[PDB]
Every structure is written in structure tokens, then in C-alpha cells.
């Protein structure tokens, strides 16, 4: 700026750490997104040897989305929630870089691995599933107690630390930090709560918990419980999938459903009789999960159709499932070898 | 925006931006080579009022305006008024503050239009000439503001605690409007850089009780707070109202603004 003090300007520029001087990352892209691209990065100034994740925020400047993501990451600190290490503001291109510890694994790739072994195992260490679930709930609970919602929870967003000091530790990542007016109506559906599909106007704690329920059904079976063809909040076939698994809610199960904007469309399109022999029990039995297991009863509390009847994250952490043998381990791999491959470089 | 509401004791606000008063005055001595201590306080008052005016034009809620005010105080707690023109910084702070919210959006044209209009209609006694900066200057300044604040954007304020206290008192109709108003005036001082919000809130509610001759001695006794720090804050509030009496910003600000140190141009 012509009329911004020169000395100040050159002094800040002399001292300003630039991402490209401190990290080697070109060619090492490991993820893409509308939100921004992620690189595996190693530290040039070799006083370190761990891997790091560099997120380059999409677009230029500080958008409302960027501003909120920096603002909240800057404050949040929990072992089960990805931890911002550093922000780089690159003044030449007005690009923003965020620095995280690198996480080798995630549940999208872990689950896909076990599903591959069904062609030719379902989560080998005994308490891996339990341990994963417990840590997901722990970190979601931290966010919920800070009145921070995730709003886009799914297996790809549940990272898992590999070899290192945090081996086997879950790291919830990629919160949806900006949603205008906290609205899902503003610019897959497999993890979306039924109230969303019937036109809920706001994200809630309970919508996150449904997604956790879906992830937990997927860890027990390796299939997405609410898998649907890839064909406005109302999505008919996704509702059809939910009901084939769960059954159709009775008036008593979800009294306030009649207040949903899309309730009348649901009545136009669907009939209770279509699903009369459908239940979560029957679904999970066909995937070799016992209906009288503590695992099943917690799962059913998490996949409750009425959001107000859905258990909270804190109540789910207190569930006796986590007291039954085997206990959850801080390393979900419980000292066993990690058979999951490392990250392919996109 | 309840995001992070209970987390003040582990917050970047508390761990990084509750400053020591002595460090503050020490870093202030550089701009005291051009301005007396009165004149520096009068400036501070002026740009609080400038930031408030902008916030109102843009229909921002008080908490957003407060955050903008706090961004501004942080920047000049470290740096001289000459490093970036505070006429450019004040609207930058408002814009940045407002993007920390997800309910609403302040467009570029709307920001620039608000800055131009507010200086002309409400501050022509201090500014003869029209607002000279374009949006490209705003975006530049944003980057330096973000850098300086170490990306610490979440800021706690006394309004939330104050509501809890008046509700607890069972005195919301009698006391909230005044107390709220006194909380606004604390931003004319350094207090938000020196004490946690709930302590400013308590100080404000005490002063409101004194003005309305309401006996609250037992309520305050029943708290567990460093009351000497509270008294410190009351004394700053009382003094501010004495500086406000004796200050005519409309007559004085053009002259104090001419004494402000000026940016060095490039070679
Ligand atoms: Cl399915 C998937 C594909 C690609 C990524 C790459 N993203 C990441 N990888 C490692 N550490 C990270 C830390 C913070 C943010 C993102 C990270 C994640 C999941």
C-alpha cells in the first residue's frame, strides 16, 4: 500500500515465514476438494522428521468459510479432533495454508480394505470397532460441548493416526465450519438423518449423532447401512433405503414428524405397509450382528428416527458396551500391525 | 453464536490477549513522542465511535461490533498509528469480524459504501476529504490484521456474562439497559485488553446499581471474585465519564489527527 509505512512493511516481509521455504510438498497432493487441496509435507529445516498435512484453502483471500475455519480451529484442542499447528498467509497470491500433523489412515480407506477382503476379515483387532466408536464420540462430544457442530460427518472425515507418537488415534477432520444461517438448505446422502431429508432448516447435535450411528453400522458390517443409488432436501430413494432397513416410523415413534416441511410429500410417496417386515434387528442379523449384543442396543439408540429421541454423545460414551470386554484402547490397532496401505498420492 | 462459549479459560483470548498493563504502556511510548496521553485516549475514543457507526450502518449486532473494536485495539497495542492508517483499519476490522459469523454476509460494495457514507455524514468534522481506499486496500490490510492477531479471531465479551448476572439478580428490567450501555462505553478504554469479560460485566452492573440507587451489596458479597480488581475497573469507568465530560471530540479531533505520526513512503 502506497500509504502504509514502508519500514513496517519491509520488516514484516523480511521476517514472514513462507510455506514454500519451510516445507517440501510439491507433487505430494493427497486430497482434493472444493474446500481446498491437501499435500503430504516434510520439513525442509530438518529439525523434525514427521509427516505433516498442508491444506491450501481454495480461492483467494479470507472467505467467510476460511475465516470461520481458522477462527474455530485456532481455539479447539482435543486429542480426537485434528489440531491446527500453523497458518501461512502468502501475500503474493493471497493463498492461505493450514498446517496439521499428518494422518496416514482414515475410515473410508480402512473400511474399503476390509470390504475388499470379503471378495477373497471384519476389523481384526477385537476392540478396534469399539475403540474407533468411543474416540469418535469423545471428539464429537468435545465439539458439541463447545456448541460446535460437524455437519458433514462420514468415514472419509474420520482420520486415524499411523506409526508415530499418536499411533492408532482417531482425528475428526473437515468440519463444515460455514453454513449460512446454520442451514442445510443453502448452497452422498448415506449419512444424513431423516429429518434432513424431510426438510429440517437447521443443523443440530442430533444430526451429527445419526451420522455416527451410520458409521458404527458400517464398521460392524463393512457395508454402508443406508447405501443408495446416486440419483431440494427431499430425496425419495434415500428415504426408501432408510425404511427398508429400519421400518416406517409409527406415529408414536416420531410424533413431531408431521411438523416436517416434507411430511405431506412423504405421505404422498410412501405407504407404511411397504415396510411391514422391516427392522434394524432383521437388517443387522443378516450381517451376523447379534440383536441382544450391547453393540446392537447402542447402535439402535444412535439410529433413532426421531431426533429428540436420539441419544446424546455423552450418554453414548456412558453406555455399558464400553465397560464390557474388550475395553477401548487409546490405539485402535491395539499394538497389532497395521495391514492398511499408506496414502496414494493423487 | 455460542461457539466456544464456555471455553474462555483455555481460549486464545485469555492465554494471549489479556496483556500486562506495563507492556502496553511501554509499547505505547513510541506514539507518545507525537501525542500526549490525553490525545492518545481521545483518539482511542474516536475510533471506537467510528467503528460503532460503521457497525450500525451495516446492521451488525453489538457483539460483532465489539469484536471489530477489539481487533483494532489489539493491532495498535503492538504497533504505531503510523504503520497502517486507522481510517483503513477500522473498516477492515469490521469486515473481518463479520466474516467470523455465518448468519449474513457483508459484500465488498456494501462495505466500501458504508465506509464512505459514515465518514461523510457522521465524521466530517474530522475528515474533510472523502474515504480514499478501495476494496483492494481492505483486502491487503486484512492480511496484516490476521497475521498480527496470530489468527486469534474468537473474542469473549461482557454482554453474555452480564445477562446471566442480571437474570440471576431478578432485575433485568431495571438494570440491563443501563448496564449494557456502560459495557458499551468500556470499549472506549483499554479494559478489554486487561481483564476477563465477566469482571468488566460485574463492574458495569455495580455502576448501574449505584446510578439507580439499588442495594446489591448482598448479591455481590455472595460471589467469589477478586473484588479489588472489580474496584480497579469501576475507577476506570468513573474516570472515563470524567474524560467524556471534558472532551469535545467534534472540536478537537481534526487537530489531534494532524498530530498523528504519518506513514513513511517507499524510496
Ligand atoms: Cl478419504 C481421505 C482422502 C484424503 C485425505 C487427505 N487429508 C489429510 N490427510 C492427512 N492428514 C490430514 C490432516 C488434516 C486435514 C486433512 C488431512 C483424507 C481422507
SS (H, E, C) chain A: CCCCCHHHHHHHHHHCCCHHHHEECCCCEEECCCCEEEEEEEECCCCCCCCEEEEEECCCCCCHHHHHHHHHHCCCCECCECCEEEEEEECCCCEEEEEEECCCEEHHHHHHHHHHHHHCCCCCCCCHHHHHHHHHHHHHHHHHHCCCCCCCCCHHHEEECCCCCCCCCEEECCCCCCCHHHCCCCCCCCCCCHHHHCCCCCCCHHHHHHHHHHHHHHHHHCCCCCCCCCCCCCCHHHHHHHHHHHCCCCCCCCHHHHHCCCHHHHHHHCCHHHHCCCCHHHHHHCCCCCCCCHHHHHHHHHCCCCHHHCCCHHHHHCCHHHCCCCCCCCCCCCCCCCCCCCCCCC
In whole angstroms, give the CA distance from residue B234 to residue B179: 12
The residue from A102, A127, A162 where one domain ends is A102
Asked if the Cβ–Cβ distance from B264 to A12 is below 8 Å, we say: no
- Which residues touch A132 (CB under 8 Å, ≥6 apart)? A107, A158, A160, A170, A219, A332
HSE of A221 in the Cβ direction (CA atoms, 13 Å)? 22
Instruction: Give the residue carrying C-alpha cell 432397513.
Output: A245
How many domains are there within chain A?
2
Q: Are residues B31 and B16 in the same domain?
A: no
Instruction: Give the residue carrying C-alpha cell 452422498.
Output: A188
* Residue B45, Cβ density class (10 Å: 0-12 exposed, 13-18 middle, ≥19 buried): buried
Residue B190 contacts residue B18 (beta carbons within 8 Å): no
Cell for B39?
A: 490525545
Q: Are residues A337 and A251 in the same domain?
A: yes
Q: Which residues pair with A99 in a beta bridge?
A: A54, A86
Q: Which residues pair with A29 in a beta bridge?
A: A39
The residue from B154, B182, B207 where one domain ends is B154
Cα A38 to middle of ligand 1, angstroms: 7
Q: Are residues B145 and B87 in the same domain?
A: yes
Residue A108 contacts residue A49 (beta carbons within 8 Å): no
Q: Are residues B32 and B61 in the same domain?
A: yes
The residue from A55, A76, A102 where one domain ends is A102
Q: Are residues B105 and B223 in the same domain?
A: no
Question: How far lies B241's CA from each of B158, B186, B238, in Å?
Answer: 19, 10, 5
Asked if the Cβ–Cβ distance from A62 to B142 is below 8 Å, we say: yes
Q: Which residues pair with A158 in a beta bridge?
A: A172
Question: How far lies B187's CA from each of A201, A310, B59, B68, B235, in Å?
Answer: 36, 44, 19, 11, 15
Cell for A18?
A: 513462507
Which CATH number do you get for residue A322?
Answer: 1.10.510.10
In whole angstroms, give the CA distance from residue B144 to residue A45: 25
Contacts of A1 in chain B (CB under 8 A): 84, 88, 137, 140-141
How was this structure determined? It was done by X-ray
Instruction: Give the residue carrying C-alpha cell 446454520.
Output: A182
Select from B263, B232, B264, B251 the least CA-distant residue to B46: B251
Residue A338 contacts residue A252 (beta carbons within 8 Å): no
Q: Are residues B198 and B262 in the same domain?
A: yes
In whole angstroms, give the CA distance from residue A228 to residue A237: 7
In whole angstroms, give the CA distance from residue B111 to residue B120: 14
Cell for B78?
A: 503492538
Q: Are residues A59 and A165 in the same domain?
A: no
**Ligand 1 atom at minimum distance from A108 CA:** 1
Q: Are residues A213 and A184 in the same domain?
A: yes
Q: Are residues B253 and B214 in the same domain?
A: yes
Q: Are residues B5 and B61 in the same domain?
A: no
Q: Are residues A70 and A117 in the same domain?
A: no
Say if ligand 1 is within 6 A of residue A82 CB: yes
Residue A18 phi, psi dihedral angles, 5° rounding = -105, 135
Q: Are residues B214 and B230 in the same domain?
A: yes
Q: Are residues A169 and A246 in the same domain?
A: yes
The residue from A102, A126, A146 where one domain ends is A102
In whole angstroms, give the CA distance from residue A204 to residue A226: 20
Select from B89, B134, B265 the least CA-distant residue to A5: B265
Q: Are residues B49 and B172 in the same domain?
A: no
Q: Are residues B90 and B163 in the same domain?
A: no
Q: Are residues B140 and B168 in the same domain?
A: no
The residue from B121, B154, B187 where one domain ends is B154
Residue numbers of the domain that contains B194: 1-22+155-267
Whether residue A32 is annotated as binding a ligand: the answer is yes
Whether residue A234 is annotated as binding a ligand: the answer is no
Q: Are residues A224 and A321 in the same domain?
A: yes
Quick one: angle between helices A205-221 and A107-119, nearest 10? 30
Q: Which helix (H) or strand (E) holds B15?
A: helix B12-17
Count of other CB atoms within 10 angstroms of residue B38:
13
Q: Are residues A108 and A180 in the same domain?
A: yes
- The catalytic site residues of A sit at 152
In whole angstroms, give the CA distance from residue B140 to residue A68: 19
Closest CB from B4, B88, B99 relative to A146: B4
Cα A109 to middle of ligand 1, angstroms: 11
Q: What angle is formed at CA A78 by the lines to CA A72 and CA A84, rounded to 5 degrees?
A: 50
Select from A59, A79, A282 the least CA-distant residue to A167: A79
Question: How far lies A167's CA from each of A102, A105, A164, A330, A332, in Å?
Answer: 11, 10, 5, 9, 8
Residue A146 contacts residue A76 (beta carbons within 8 Å): yes
B155: left (phi over 0), alpha (psi -120 to 50) or beta: beta
Q: Are residues A126 and A22 in the same domain?
A: no
Q: Are residues A209 and A245 in the same domain?
A: yes
Q: Are residues A54 and A198 in the same domain?
A: no
Furthest-apart CA atoms within chain B: distance in Å: 65
Which CATH number do you get for residue A36?
Answer: 3.30.200.20
Q: Are residues A94 and A163 in the same domain?
A: no
HSE of A40 in the Cβ direction (CA atoms, 13 Å)? 14
Resolution (A): 2.5
Select from A111, A135, A130, A131 the least CA-distant residue to A121: A111
How many domains are there within chain B?
2
Query: DSSP secondary-structure letter at B101?
Result: -
Residue numbers of the domain that contains A176: 103-346
Q: Are residues B132 and B161 in the same domain?
A: no
Instruction: Give the residue carrying C-alpha cell 489468527.
Output: B151
User: How many CB pairs below 8 A link A and B?
Assistant: 109
Cis, bond preceding A326 (omega within 30 deg of 0): yes
Q: What SS3 class is residue B185?
A: helix
Asked if the Cβ–Cβ distance from B102 to A70 is below 8 Å, we say: no
The residue from B154, B171, B202 where one domain ends is B154
Select from A80, A85, A51 the least CA-distant residue to A70: A85
Select from A279, A313, A305, A308 the least CA-distant residue to A137: A313
Residue A134 contacts residue A186 (beta carbons within 8 Å): no
Quick one: angle between helices B227-246 and B37-57, nearest 10? 90
Select from B217, B188, B222 the least CA-distant residue to B205: B217
* Torsion from C-alpha of A35, A38, A43, A45, nearest 10 degrees: -40
Cα A119 to middle of ligand 1, angstroms: 27
Which CATH number do you get for residue B123?
Answer: 1.10.472.10
Q: Are residues A5 and A51 in the same domain?
A: yes
Amino acid at each position: 500500500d502506497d500509504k502504509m509505512d514502508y519500514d513496517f512493511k519491509v520488516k514484516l516481509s523480511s521476517e514472514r515465514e513462507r510455506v514454500e521455504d519451510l516445507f517440501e510438498y510439491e507433487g505430494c497432493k493427497v486430497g482434493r476438494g472444493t474446500y481446498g487441496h491437501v499435500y503430504k509435507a516434510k520439513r525442509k529445516d530438518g529439525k523434525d522428521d514427521k509427516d505433516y498435512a498442508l491444506k491450501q484453502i481454495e480461492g483467494t483471500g479470507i472467505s467467510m468459510s476460511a475465516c470461520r475455519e481458522i477462527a474455530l480451529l485456532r481455539e479447539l484442542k482435543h486429542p480426537n479432533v485434528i489440531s491446527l499447528q500453523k497458518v501461512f498467509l502468502s501475500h503474493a497470491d493471497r493463498k492461505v495454508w493450514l498446517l496439521f500433523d499428518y494422518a496416514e489412515h482414515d475410515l473410508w480407506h480402512i473400511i474399503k480394505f476390509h470390504r475388499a477382503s470379503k471378495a477373497n476379515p471384519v476389523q481384526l483387532p477385537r476392540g478396534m470397532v469399539k475403540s474407533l466408536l468411543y474416540q469418535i464420540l469423545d471428539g464429537i462430544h468435545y465439539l458439541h460441548a463447545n456448541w460446535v457442530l460437524h455437519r458433514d460427518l462420514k468415514p472419509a472425515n474420520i482420520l486415524v493416526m499411523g506409526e508415530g507418537p499418536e499411533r492408532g488415534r482417531v482425528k475428526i477432520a473437515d468440519m463444515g465450519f460455514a453454513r449460512l444461517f446454520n442451514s442445510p438448505l443453502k448452497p452422498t446422502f448415506w449419512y444424513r438423518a431423516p429429518e434432513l431429508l424431510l426438510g429440517a432448516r437447521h443443523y443440530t447435535k442430533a444430526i451429527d449423532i445419526w451420522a455416527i450411528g451410520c458409521i458404527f453400522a458400517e464398521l460392524l458390517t463393512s457395508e454402508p447401512i443406508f447405501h443408495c443409488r446416486q440419483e431440494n432436501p427431499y430425496h425419495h430413494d434415500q428415504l426408501d433405503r432408510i425404511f427398508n432397513v429400519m421400518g416406517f416410523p409409527a406415529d408414536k415413534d416420531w410424533e413431531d414428524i408431521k411438523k416436517m416441511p416434507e411430511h405431506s410429500t412423504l405421505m404422498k410417496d410412501f405407504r407404511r405397509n411397504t415396510y411391514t417386515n422391516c427392522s434394524l434387528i432383521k437388517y443387522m442379523e443378516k450381517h451376523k450382528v447379534k440383536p441382544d449384543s450391547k453393540a446392537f442396543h447402542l447402535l439402535q439408540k444412535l439410529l433413532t428416527m426421531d431426533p429428540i429421541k436420539r441419544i446424546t454423545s455423552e450418554q453414548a460414551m456412558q453406555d455399558p458396551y464400553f465397560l464390557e470386554d474388550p475395553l477401548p484402547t487409546s490405539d485402535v490397532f491395539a499394538g497389532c500391525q497395521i495391514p492398511y496401505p499408506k496414502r496414494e498420492f493423487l | 453464536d455460542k461457539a466456544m462459549a464456555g471455553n474462555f479459560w483455555q481460549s486464545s483470548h485469555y492465554l494471549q490477549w489479556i496483556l500486562d498493563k506495563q507492556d502496553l504502556l511501554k509499547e505505547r511510548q513510541k506514539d507518545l513522542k507525537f501525542l500526549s496521553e490525553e490525545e492518545y485516549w481521545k483518539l482511542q475514543i474516536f475510533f471506537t465511535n467510528v467503528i460503532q457507526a460503521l457497525g450500525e450502518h451495516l446492521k451488525l449486532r453489538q457483539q460483532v461490533i465489539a469484536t471489530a473494536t477489539v481487533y483494532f485495539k489489539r493491532f495498535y497495542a503492538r504497533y504505531s498509528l503510523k504503520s497502517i492508517d486507522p481510517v483503513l483499519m477500522a473498516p477492515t476490522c469490521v469486515f473481518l469480524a463479520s466474516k467470523v459469523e455465518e448468519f449474513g454476509v457483508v459484500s465488498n460494495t456494501r462495505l466500501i459504501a458504508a465506509a464512505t457514507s459514515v465518514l461523510k455524514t457522521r465524521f466530517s468534522y474530522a475528515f474533510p476529504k472523502e474515504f480514499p481506499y478501495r476494496m483492494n486496500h481492505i483486502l491487503e490490510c486484512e492480511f496484516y490484521l490476521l497475521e498480527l492477531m496470530d489468527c486469534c479471531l474468537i473474542v469473549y465479551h461482557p454482554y453474555r456474562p452480564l445477562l446471566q448476572y442480571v437474570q440471576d439478580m431478578g432485575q433485568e428490567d431495571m438494570l440491563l439497559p443501563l448496564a449494557w450501555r456502560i459495557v458499551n462505553d468500556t470499549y472506549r478504554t483499554d479494559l478489554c485488553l486487561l481483564y476477563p469479560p465477566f469482571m468488566i460485566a460485574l463492574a458495569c452492573l455495580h455502576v448501574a446499581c449505584v446510578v439507580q440507587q439499588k442495594d446489591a451489596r448482598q448479591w455481590f458479597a455472595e460471589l467469589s471474585v477478586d473484588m479489588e480488581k472489580i474496584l480497579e475497573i469501576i475507577r476506570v469507568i468513573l474516570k472515563l465519564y470524567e474524560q467524556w465530560k471534558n472532551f469535545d471530540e467534534r472540536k478537537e479531533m481534526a487537530t489531534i489527527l494532524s498530530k498523528m505520526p504519518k506513514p513513511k513512503p517507499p524510496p
